[PDB]
Scaffold this motif. Structure first.
Motif, PDB file in Angstrom:
ATOM      1  N   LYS A 188       0.800  -1.219   0.000  1.00 60.47           N
ATOM      2  CA  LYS A 188       0.000   0.000   0.000  1.00 60.47           C
ATOM      3  C   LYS A 188       0.835   1.273   0.000  1.00 60.47           C
ATOM      4  CE  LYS A 188      -3.913   2.261   2.219  1.00 60.47           C
ATOM      5  NZ  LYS A 188      -5.030   2.141   3.192  1.00 60.47           N
ATOM      6  N   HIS A 189       2.023   1.206   0.588  1.00 56.49           N
ATOM      7  CA  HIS A 189       2.874   2.385   0.651  1.00 56.49           C
ATOM      8  C   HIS A 189       4.061   2.357  -0.301  1.00 56.49           C
ATOM      9  CE1 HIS A 189       0.480   2.305   4.353  1.00 56.49           C
ATOM     10  NE2 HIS A 189       0.416   3.606   4.138  1.00 56.49           N
ATOM     11  N   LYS A 190       4.688   3.516  -0.482  1.00 50.04           N
ATOM     12  CA  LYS A 190       5.779   3.657  -1.440  1.00 50.04           C
ATOM     13  C   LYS A 190       7.190   3.930  -0.919  1.00 50.04           C
ATOM     14  CE  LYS A 190       7.191   4.174  -5.795  1.00 50.04           C
ATOM     15  NZ  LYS A 190       7.024   3.175  -6.884  1.00 50.04           N
ATOM     16  N   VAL A 191       7.334   4.970  -0.106  1.00 52.89           N
ATOM     17  CA  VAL A 191       8.641   5.370   0.414  1.00 52.89           C
ATOM     18  C   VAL A 191       9.023   4.730   1.746  1.00 52.89           C
ATOM     19  CG1 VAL A 191      10.130   7.344   0.893  1.00 52.89           C
ATOM     20  CG2 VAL A 191       8.235   7.572  -0.728  1.00 52.89           C
ATOM     21  N   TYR A 192      10.111   3.966   1.730  1.00 55.83           N
ATOM     22  CA  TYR A 192      10.602   3.301   2.925  1.00 55.83           C
ATOM     23  C   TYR A 192      11.957   3.866   3.307  1.00 55.83           C
ATOM     24  CZ  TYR A 192       6.658   0.347   2.238  1.00 55.83           C
ATOM     25  OH  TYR A 192       5.341  -0.033   2.155  1.00 55.83           O
ATOM     26  N   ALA A 193      12.058   4.348   4.541  1.00 55.26           N
ATOM     27  CA  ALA A 193      13.295   4.963   4.995  1.00 55.26           C
ATOM     28  C   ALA A 193      13.741   4.596   6.401  1.00 55.26           C
ATOM     29  CB  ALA A 193      13.168   6.486   4.876  1.00 55.26           C
ATOM     30  N   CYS A 194      15.058   4.552   6.571  1.00 58.25           N
ATOM     31  CA  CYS A 194      15.692   4.263   7.844  1.00 58.25           C
ATOM     32  C   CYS A 194      16.494   5.511   8.203  1.00 58.25           C
ATOM     33  CB  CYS A 194      16.641   3.069   7.698  1.00 58.25           C
ATOM     34  SG  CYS A 194      17.515   2.652   9.233  1.00 58.25           S
ATOM     35  N   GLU A 195      16.101   6.198   9.274  1.00 59.27           N
ATOM     36  CA  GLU A 195      16.808   7.403   9.708  1.00 59.27           C
ATOM     37  C   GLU A 195      17.713   7.055  10.876  1.00 59.27           C
ATOM     38  OE1 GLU A 195      15.335  11.772  11.022  1.00 59.27           O
ATOM     39  OE2 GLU A 195      15.392  10.250  12.610  1.00 59.27           O
ATOM     40  N   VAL A 196      18.990   7.392  10.744  1.00 63.36           N
ATOM     41  CA  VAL A 196      19.957   7.090  11.780  1.00 63.36           C
ATOM     42  C   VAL A 196      20.626   8.310  12.402  1.00 63.36           C
ATOM     43  CG1 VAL A 196      22.138   5.940  12.275  1.00 63.36           C
ATOM     44  CG2 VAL A 196      20.429   4.827  10.801  1.00 63.36           C
ATOM     45  N   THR A 197      20.660   8.334  13.731  1.00 63.61           N
ATOM     46  CA  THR A 197      21.320   9.401  14.473  1.00 63.61           C
ATOM     47  C   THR A 197      22.426   8.729  15.283  1.00 63.61           C
ATOM     48  OG1 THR A 197      19.461   9.217  16.043  1.00 63.61           O
ATOM     49  CG2 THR A 197      19.538  11.173  14.636  1.00 63.61           C
ATOM     50  N   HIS A 198      23.559   9.410  15.402  1.00 61.23           N
ATOM     51  CA  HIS A 198      24.707   8.862  16.109  1.00 61.23           C
ATOM     52  C   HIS A 198      25.703   9.984  16.364  1.00 61.23           C
ATOM     53  CE1 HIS A 198      28.610   6.699  16.423  1.00 61.23           C
ATOM     54  NE2 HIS A 198      27.879   5.767  17.008  1.00 61.23           N
TER      55      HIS A 198
END
Lengths: 213, 220
Positions: A188-198
Protein backbone atom coordinates in the motif's frame (compact mmCIF):
# COMPACT_ATOMS: atom_id res chain seq x y z
CA UNK A 1 14.54 -7.80 49.82
CA UNK A 2 17.67 -5.80 50.60
CA UNK A 3 18.29 -3.95 47.35
CA UNK A 4 21.83 -3.45 46.06
CA UNK A 5 21.72 -0.55 43.59
CA UNK A 6 24.68 -0.76 41.22
CA UNK A 7 25.98 2.04 39.00
CA UNK A 8 26.86 2.70 36.31
CA UNK A 9 25.08 0.14 34.12
CA UNK A 10 27.67 0.54 31.36
CA UNK A 11 31.00 2.32 31.05
CA UNK A 12 33.89 2.72 28.63
CA UNK A 13 37.56 2.97 29.51
CA UNK A 14 41.05 2.78 28.02
CA UNK A 15 43.92 0.43 28.82
CA UNK A 16 45.90 1.84 31.71
CA UNK A 17 43.02 3.84 33.16
CA UNK A 18 41.07 3.35 36.38
CA UNK A 19 37.47 2.14 36.72
CA UNK A 20 35.15 2.72 39.67
CA UNK A 21 31.89 0.82 40.23
CA UNK A 22 29.41 1.63 43.00
CA UNK A 23 26.82 -0.39 44.93
CA UNK A 24 24.49 1.09 47.52
CA UNK A 25 22.50 -1.06 49.96
CA UNK A 26 18.95 -0.35 51.14
CA UNK A 27 19.98 -1.48 54.66
CA UNK A 28 23.33 -1.62 56.46
CA UNK A 29 25.14 -4.81 55.40
CA UNK A 30 28.36 -4.23 57.33
CA UNK A 31 31.23 -5.53 55.22
CA UNK A 32 29.45 -8.67 54.05
CA UNK A 33 29.82 -7.70 50.40
CA UNK A 34 31.36 -9.56 47.47
CA UNK A 35 32.26 -8.54 43.91
CA UNK A 36 32.34 -10.80 40.86
CA UNK A 37 33.53 -10.66 37.26
CA UNK A 38 31.59 -12.40 34.49
CA UNK A 39 32.31 -12.81 30.79
CA UNK A 40 29.75 -13.93 28.15
CA UNK A 41 28.86 -17.61 28.26
CA UNK A 42 30.75 -18.08 31.51
CA UNK A 43 29.88 -18.35 35.19
CA UNK A 44 30.82 -15.57 37.64
CA UNK A 45 34.29 -15.48 39.19
CA UNK A 46 34.96 -14.14 42.68
CA UNK A 47 37.07 -10.98 42.95
CA UNK A 48 36.49 -9.56 46.42
CA UNK A 49 34.72 -10.73 49.59
CA UNK A 50 34.25 -9.11 53.01
CA UNK A 51 34.10 -5.83 51.06
CA UNK A 52 37.88 -5.47 50.71
CA UNK A 53 39.50 -8.92 50.83
CA UNK A 54 40.90 -9.82 47.43
CA UNK A 55 40.31 -13.46 46.56
CA UNK A 56 43.30 -15.66 45.79
CA UNK A 57 44.60 -15.50 42.23
CA UNK A 58 42.96 -12.14 41.55
CA UNK A 59 45.18 -9.34 40.18
CA UNK A 60 46.12 -6.69 42.76
CA UNK A 61 44.69 -4.18 40.27
CA UNK A 62 41.28 -5.04 41.74
CA UNK A 63 40.39 -3.37 45.03
CA UNK A 64 37.20 -3.23 47.04
CA UNK A 65 36.19 -0.72 49.70
CA UNK A 66 33.24 0.41 51.77
CA UNK A 67 31.47 -0.33 55.04
CA UNK A 68 27.79 -0.03 55.83
CA UNK A 69 25.81 0.81 52.72
CA UNK A 70 28.16 2.26 50.08
CA UNK A 71 30.64 -0.08 48.41
CA UNK A 72 33.14 0.44 45.61
CA UNK A 73 35.02 -1.85 43.25
CA UNK A 74 38.06 -0.15 41.76
CA UNK A 75 40.06 -1.48 38.83
CA UNK A 76 43.43 0.18 38.31
CA UNK A 77 45.61 0.02 35.20
CA UNK A 78 42.74 -1.40 33.15
CA UNK A 79 43.72 -4.31 30.89
CA UNK A 80 41.91 -5.77 27.87
CA UNK A 81 41.18 -8.96 29.81
CA UNK A 82 39.19 -6.87 32.28
CA UNK A 83 36.51 -6.11 29.70
CA UNK A 84 33.48 -7.92 31.12
CA UNK A 85 30.47 -7.56 33.41
CA UNK A 86 30.94 -6.88 37.13
CA UNK A 87 28.44 -7.16 39.94
CA UNK A 88 28.17 -6.87 43.69
CA UNK A 89 26.33 -8.99 46.22
CA UNK A 90 25.42 -8.68 49.88
CA UNK A 91 25.30 -11.75 52.13
CA UNK A 92 24.68 -9.95 55.41
CA UNK A 93 21.06 -11.08 55.29
CA UNK A 94 18.95 -13.65 53.47
CA UNK A 95 17.72 -13.65 50.84
CA UNK A 96 21.12 -12.86 49.36
CA UNK A 97 20.86 -10.10 46.75
CA UNK A 98 22.93 -8.87 43.80
CA UNK A 99 23.60 -5.60 42.05
CA UNK A 100 22.22 -5.15 38.55
CA UNK A 101 25.68 -5.31 37.01
CA UNK A 102 28.08 -3.04 35.12
CA UNK A 103 29.43 -3.79 31.65
CA UNK A 104 32.91 -2.39 31.01
CA UNK A 105 33.77 -1.77 27.34
CA UNK A 106 36.90 -0.42 25.67
CA UNK A 107 36.97 3.13 24.31
CA UNK A 108 38.08 4.14 20.82
CA UNK A 109 37.76 7.11 18.48
CA UNK A 110 34.20 7.91 17.40
CA UNK A 111 33.20 6.16 14.18
CA UNK A 112 30.02 6.99 12.29
CA UNK A 113 27.94 4.03 11.10
CA UNK A 114 27.75 3.10 7.43
CA UNK A 115 24.04 2.59 6.78
CA UNK A 116 22.35 0.19 4.36
CA UNK A 117 18.66 -0.51 3.79
CA UNK A 118 17.24 -3.76 2.38
CA UNK A 119 13.76 -4.19 0.90
CA UNK A 120 11.85 -7.45 1.54
CA UNK A 121 12.55 -10.26 -0.93
CA UNK A 122 9.82 -11.29 -3.37
CA UNK A 123 10.27 -14.79 -1.97
CA UNK A 124 9.23 -13.63 1.50
CA UNK A 125 6.28 -11.59 0.25
CA UNK A 126 4.70 -14.87 -0.82
CA UNK A 127 4.38 -15.59 2.91
CA UNK A 128 2.19 -12.58 3.63
CA UNK A 129 4.90 -10.82 5.62
CA UNK A 130 7.42 -8.16 4.66
CA UNK A 131 10.66 -7.67 6.58
CA UNK A 132 12.56 -4.46 5.85
CA UNK A 133 16.09 -4.38 7.25
CA UNK A 134 18.42 -1.53 8.15
CA UNK A 135 22.11 -2.18 8.84
CA UNK A 136 24.33 0.17 10.86
CA UNK A 137 27.89 -1.01 10.28
CA UNK A 138 31.10 -0.63 12.32
CA UNK A 139 30.31 2.36 14.52
CA UNK A 140 31.37 3.69 17.92
CA UNK A 141 30.08 4.44 20.53
CA UNK A 142 27.36 1.81 20.86
CA UNK A 143 24.55 4.36 21.29
CA UNK A 144 22.57 4.79 18.08
CA UNK A 145 19.01 5.66 17.15
CA UNK A 146 17.13 4.14 14.23
CA UNK A 147 13.76 5.57 13.20
CA UNK A 148 11.68 3.84 10.54
CA UNK A 149 9.44 5.90 8.29
CA UNK A 150 6.89 4.76 5.71
CA UNK A 151 5.64 7.49 3.37
CA UNK A 152 7.27 9.77 5.93
CA UNK A 153 5.05 8.53 8.76
CA UNK A 154 6.99 7.54 11.88
CA UNK A 155 6.80 3.84 12.72
CA UNK A 156 6.43 2.64 16.30
CA UNK A 157 6.44 -0.79 17.89
CA UNK A 158 6.93 -2.81 14.71
CA UNK A 159 10.72 -3.08 14.70
CA UNK A 160 13.26 -5.20 16.57
CA UNK A 161 17.00 -4.60 16.78
CA UNK A 162 20.10 -6.65 17.56
CA UNK A 163 23.62 -5.40 18.34
CA UNK A 164 26.93 -7.25 18.08
CA UNK A 165 29.60 -7.38 20.75
CA UNK A 166 32.57 -5.04 20.41
CA UNK A 167 34.71 -6.15 17.47
CA UNK A 168 37.96 -7.79 18.56
CA UNK A 169 40.02 -5.98 15.93
CA UNK A 170 38.54 -2.48 15.57
CA UNK A 171 36.40 -2.19 18.72
CA UNK A 172 33.28 -1.10 16.81
CA UNK A 173 29.67 -2.27 17.01
CA UNK A 174 27.15 -3.09 14.31
CA UNK A 175 23.39 -3.25 14.62
CA UNK A 176 20.50 -4.58 12.61
CA UNK A 177 16.94 -3.30 12.79
CA UNK A 178 14.11 -5.26 11.21
CA UNK A 179 10.77 -3.62 10.45
CA UNK A 180 7.90 -6.11 10.24
CA UNK A 181 4.97 -5.19 7.98
CA UNK A 182 2.09 -7.18 6.54
CA UNK A 183 2.32 -7.72 2.80
CA UNK A 184 -0.80 -5.59 2.32
CA UNK A 185 0.71 -2.70 4.28
CA UNK A 186 3.97 -2.94 2.35
CA UNK A 187 2.16 -2.98 -1.00
CA UNK A 188 0.00 0.00 0.00
CA UNK A 189 2.87 2.38 0.65
CA UNK A 190 5.78 3.66 -1.44
CA UNK A 191 8.64 5.37 0.41
CA UNK A 192 10.60 3.30 2.93
CA UNK A 193 13.29 4.96 4.99
CA UNK A 194 15.69 4.26 7.84
CA UNK A 195 16.81 7.40 9.71
CA UNK A 196 19.96 7.09 11.78
CA UNK A 197 21.32 9.40 14.47
CA UNK A 198 24.71 8.86 16.11
CA UNK A 199 27.46 10.85 17.81
CA UNK A 200 29.61 10.48 14.70
CA UNK A 201 27.04 11.94 12.30
CA UNK A 202 26.96 15.73 11.90
CA UNK A 203 23.40 15.35 10.64
CA UNK A 204 20.98 12.38 10.56
CA UNK A 205 21.61 9.87 7.78
CA UNK A 206 18.57 8.48 6.01
CA UNK A 207 18.72 5.54 3.61
CA UNK A 208 15.60 4.96 1.56
CA UNK A 209 14.02 3.10 -1.32
CA UNK A 210 10.70 3.24 -3.16
CA UNK A 211 8.70 0.04 -3.62
CA UNK A 212 8.31 -0.78 -7.30
CA UNK A 213 9.95 -3.05 -9.88
CA UNK B 1 39.72 -28.89 43.33
CA UNK B 2 36.03 -28.13 43.86
CA UNK B 3 33.97 -28.84 40.75
CA UNK B 4 30.23 -28.42 40.16
CA UNK B 5 28.69 -29.96 37.03
CA UNK B 6 25.28 -28.96 35.65
CA UNK B 7 23.46 -29.98 32.45
CA UNK B 8 23.49 -27.91 29.26
CA UNK B 9 20.26 -26.58 27.78
CA UNK B 10 16.68 -27.67 28.31
CA UNK B 11 13.50 -26.76 26.44
CA UNK B 12 10.25 -27.08 28.39
CA UNK B 13 6.60 -26.20 27.81
CA UNK B 14 4.64 -23.76 30.00
CA UNK B 15 2.93 -25.51 32.90
CA UNK B 16 5.53 -28.27 32.93
CA UNK B 17 8.39 -28.77 35.38
CA UNK B 18 12.13 -29.26 35.08
CA UNK B 19 14.66 -30.82 37.46
CA UNK B 20 18.17 -29.41 37.18
CA UNK B 21 21.18 -31.35 38.44
CA UNK B 22 24.47 -30.24 39.99
CA UNK B 23 27.08 -32.98 40.40
CA UNK B 24 29.71 -32.03 42.95
CA UNK B 25 33.30 -33.22 43.30
CA UNK B 26 36.57 -32.25 44.95
CA UNK B 27 35.13 -31.95 48.46
CA UNK B 28 32.90 -33.63 51.03
CA UNK B 29 29.50 -33.01 49.47
CA UNK B 30 27.57 -33.32 52.73
CA UNK B 31 29.83 -30.67 54.20
CA UNK B 32 28.96 -27.29 52.64
CA UNK B 33 25.65 -25.65 51.84
CA UNK B 34 24.73 -25.66 48.15
CA UNK B 35 23.14 -22.46 46.84
CA UNK B 36 21.17 -21.83 43.66
CA UNK B 37 21.03 -18.66 41.59
CA UNK B 38 18.99 -17.45 38.61
CA UNK B 39 20.25 -15.16 35.84
CA UNK B 40 18.10 -13.61 33.12
CA UNK B 41 19.60 -11.65 30.19
CA UNK B 42 20.66 -8.32 31.66
CA UNK B 43 18.35 -8.66 34.66
CA UNK B 44 20.64 -8.95 37.67
CA UNK B 45 21.19 -12.27 39.44
CA UNK B 46 18.67 -13.58 41.98
CA UNK B 47 19.32 -15.92 44.91
CA UNK B 48 16.82 -18.79 44.94
CA UNK B 49 17.77 -20.71 48.05
CA UNK B 50 20.20 -23.10 49.70
CA UNK B 51 20.30 -26.68 50.93
CA UNK B 52 22.28 -28.54 53.63
CA UNK B 53 23.12 -31.89 51.97
CA UNK B 54 23.81 -33.54 55.33
CA UNK B 55 20.42 -32.86 56.94
CA UNK B 56 18.50 -32.02 53.80
CA UNK B 57 17.54 -28.75 55.45
CA UNK B 58 16.55 -25.94 53.11
CA UNK B 59 15.97 -22.18 53.09
CA UNK B 60 14.28 -20.25 50.28
CA UNK B 61 13.94 -16.75 48.91
CA UNK B 62 10.24 -16.03 49.55
CA UNK B 63 10.06 -15.06 45.87
CA UNK B 64 10.82 -18.64 44.81
CA UNK B 65 9.06 -20.44 47.67
CA UNK B 66 6.23 -21.70 45.47
CA UNK B 67 8.33 -22.45 42.39
CA UNK B 68 11.59 -24.07 43.45
CA UNK B 69 12.22 -27.25 45.42
CA UNK B 70 15.75 -28.16 46.43
CA UNK B 71 16.77 -31.75 47.13
CA UNK B 72 19.90 -33.84 47.20
CA UNK B 73 21.10 -37.37 46.54
CA UNK B 74 23.93 -38.22 48.94
CA UNK B 75 24.94 -41.48 47.21
CA UNK B 76 25.66 -39.61 43.97
CA UNK B 77 26.84 -36.35 45.57
CA UNK B 78 24.29 -34.50 43.43
CA UNK B 79 22.09 -31.51 44.25
CA UNK B 80 18.82 -30.93 42.40
CA UNK B 81 16.48 -28.00 41.88
CA UNK B 82 12.97 -28.60 40.61
CA UNK B 83 11.12 -25.68 39.05
CA UNK B 84 7.34 -26.13 38.78
CA UNK B 85 4.44 -24.65 36.77
CA UNK B 86 6.88 -23.10 34.31
CA UNK B 87 6.23 -19.77 32.58
CA UNK B 88 8.22 -17.57 30.19
CA UNK B 89 9.64 -15.68 33.17
CA UNK B 90 11.35 -18.88 34.34
CA UNK B 91 13.49 -18.91 31.20
CA UNK B 92 17.02 -18.15 32.41
CA UNK B 93 20.45 -19.54 33.19
CA UNK B 94 20.50 -21.31 36.55
CA UNK B 95 23.61 -21.92 38.64
CA UNK B 96 24.54 -23.92 41.71
CA UNK B 97 27.25 -22.32 43.84
CA UNK B 98 27.92 -21.33 47.48
CA UNK B 99 27.15 -18.17 49.55
CA UNK B 100 29.88 -15.94 48.08
CA UNK B 101 32.25 -18.21 46.24
CA UNK B 102 34.52 -18.76 43.27
CA UNK B 103 32.91 -22.18 42.84
CA UNK B 104 30.08 -22.14 40.30
CA UNK B 105 28.44 -24.61 37.97
CA UNK B 106 28.78 -23.65 34.30
CA UNK B 107 25.08 -22.88 34.30
CA UNK B 108 22.09 -24.61 32.74
CA UNK B 109 19.90 -22.69 30.31
CA UNK B 110 16.17 -23.29 30.58
CA UNK B 111 13.95 -22.06 27.75
CA UNK B 112 10.20 -22.15 28.42
CA UNK B 113 8.15 -22.15 25.21
CA UNK B 114 5.12 -23.77 23.58
CA UNK B 115 6.75 -23.59 20.14
CA UNK B 116 7.50 -26.65 18.03
CA UNK B 117 10.73 -27.51 16.24
CA UNK B 118 10.95 -25.57 12.98
CA UNK B 119 13.71 -25.00 10.46
CA UNK B 120 14.33 -21.44 9.26
CA UNK B 121 13.31 -19.70 6.06
CA UNK B 122 16.33 -17.96 4.56
CA UNK B 123 15.73 -14.77 2.61
CA UNK B 124 18.31 -12.67 0.77
CA UNK B 125 19.34 -9.19 1.85
CA UNK B 126 20.36 -8.20 -1.68
CA UNK B 127 23.22 -5.73 -2.21
CA UNK B 128 21.65 -2.30 -2.81
CA UNK B 129 21.37 -1.68 -6.55
CA UNK B 130 22.42 0.77 -9.27
CA UNK B 131 25.84 2.21 -8.42
CA UNK B 132 27.66 2.31 -5.09
CA UNK B 133 27.73 5.35 -2.80
CA UNK B 134 31.05 4.51 -1.18
CA UNK B 135 32.56 1.68 -3.19
CA UNK B 136 31.40 -0.60 -0.38
CA UNK B 137 28.32 -2.79 -0.65
CA UNK B 138 26.42 -4.73 2.00
CA UNK B 139 24.55 -8.00 1.60
CA UNK B 140 23.33 -10.77 3.84
CA UNK B 141 20.79 -13.39 4.80
CA UNK B 142 17.68 -13.04 6.92
CA UNK B 143 17.28 -16.34 8.77
CA UNK B 144 13.79 -16.23 10.20
CA UNK B 145 11.06 -18.23 11.88
CA UNK B 146 13.06 -21.05 13.44
CA UNK B 147 12.92 -22.85 16.78
CA UNK B 148 14.67 -23.64 19.01
CA UNK B 149 18.00 -21.81 19.03
CA UNK B 150 20.64 -21.91 17.76
CA UNK B 151 21.46 -21.40 14.10
CA UNK B 152 24.93 -20.85 12.70
CA UNK B 153 25.92 -18.90 9.61
CA UNK B 154 29.10 -18.93 7.55
CA UNK B 155 29.87 -17.34 4.19
CA UNK B 156 31.28 -19.00 1.07
CA UNK B 157 31.85 -22.23 2.97
CA UNK B 158 34.15 -20.37 5.35
CA UNK B 159 36.14 -18.67 2.60
CA UNK B 160 34.64 -15.31 3.63
CA UNK B 161 35.07 -14.06 7.20
CA UNK B 162 36.36 -10.49 7.12
CA UNK B 163 33.56 -7.96 7.47
CA UNK B 164 30.99 -10.57 8.48
CA UNK B 165 28.52 -9.70 11.23
CA UNK B 166 26.10 -12.36 12.44
CA UNK B 167 23.70 -10.71 14.86
CA UNK B 168 22.24 -12.13 18.05
CA UNK B 169 18.93 -13.83 17.36
CA UNK B 170 15.76 -12.11 18.49
CA UNK B 171 12.61 -13.77 19.80
CA UNK B 172 9.65 -12.62 17.72
CA UNK B 173 6.13 -12.12 19.05
CA UNK B 174 5.22 -15.34 17.23
CA UNK B 175 7.47 -17.33 19.55
CA UNK B 176 9.92 -18.06 16.73
CA UNK B 177 13.46 -16.74 16.39
CA UNK B 178 15.02 -14.68 13.63
CA UNK B 179 18.50 -13.34 12.98
CA UNK B 180 20.41 -11.69 10.20
CA UNK B 181 23.95 -12.24 9.00
CA UNK B 182 25.59 -9.56 6.88
CA UNK B 183 28.90 -8.81 5.23
CA UNK B 184 30.35 -5.75 3.54
CA UNK B 185 32.29 -6.30 0.31
CA UNK B 186 33.59 -4.10 -2.51
CA UNK B 187 30.79 -2.99 -4.82
CA UNK B 188 33.20 -3.76 -7.67
CA UNK B 189 33.15 -7.43 -6.61
CA UNK B 190 29.42 -8.01 -7.08
CA UNK B 191 29.92 -9.06 -10.70
CA UNK B 192 33.01 -11.23 -10.19
CA UNK B 193 32.43 -13.02 -6.88
CA UNK B 194 29.52 -15.15 -5.69
CA UNK B 195 28.23 -14.71 -2.14
CA UNK B 196 26.51 -17.64 -0.44
CA UNK B 197 25.44 -17.87 3.18
CA UNK B 198 25.69 -21.32 4.75
CA UNK B 199 22.93 -21.68 7.32
CA UNK B 200 22.73 -24.55 9.76
CA UNK B 201 19.93 -25.24 12.22
CA UNK B 202 21.14 -28.32 14.09
CA UNK B 203 18.04 -28.68 16.28
CA UNK B 204 16.13 -29.64 13.13
CA UNK B 205 19.22 -31.01 11.39
CA UNK B 206 18.41 -28.54 8.62
CA UNK B 207 21.09 -26.93 6.48
CA UNK B 208 20.76 -24.61 3.51
CA UNK B 209 23.17 -22.65 1.32
CA UNK B 210 21.59 -19.50 -0.11
CA UNK B 211 23.20 -17.51 -2.92
CA UNK B 212 22.68 -13.76 -2.51
CA UNK B 213 22.71 -11.66 -5.67
CA UNK B 214 21.69 -8.16 -6.77
CA UNK B 215 18.00 -7.81 -7.62
CA UNK B 216 17.25 -7.55 -11.34
CA UNK B 217 13.98 -6.41 -12.90
CA UNK B 218 14.71 -8.61 -15.91
CA UNK B 219 14.77 -11.83 -13.90
CA UNK B 220 11.85 -13.91 -12.63
Amino acid sequence: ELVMTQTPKFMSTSVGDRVSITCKASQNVGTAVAWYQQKPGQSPKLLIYSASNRYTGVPDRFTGSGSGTDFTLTISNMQSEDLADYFCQQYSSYPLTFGGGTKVEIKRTVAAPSVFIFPPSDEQLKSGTASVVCLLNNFYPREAKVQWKVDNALQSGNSQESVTEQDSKDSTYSLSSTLTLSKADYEKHKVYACEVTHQGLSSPVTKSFNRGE
Amino acid sequence: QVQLLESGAELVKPGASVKLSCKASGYTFTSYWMHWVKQRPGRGLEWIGRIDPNSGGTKYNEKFKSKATLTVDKPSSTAYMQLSSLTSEDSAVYYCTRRDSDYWGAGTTVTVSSASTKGPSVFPLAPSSKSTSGGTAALGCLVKDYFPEPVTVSWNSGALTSGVHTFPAVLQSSGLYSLSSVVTVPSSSLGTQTYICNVNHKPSNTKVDKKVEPKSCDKT
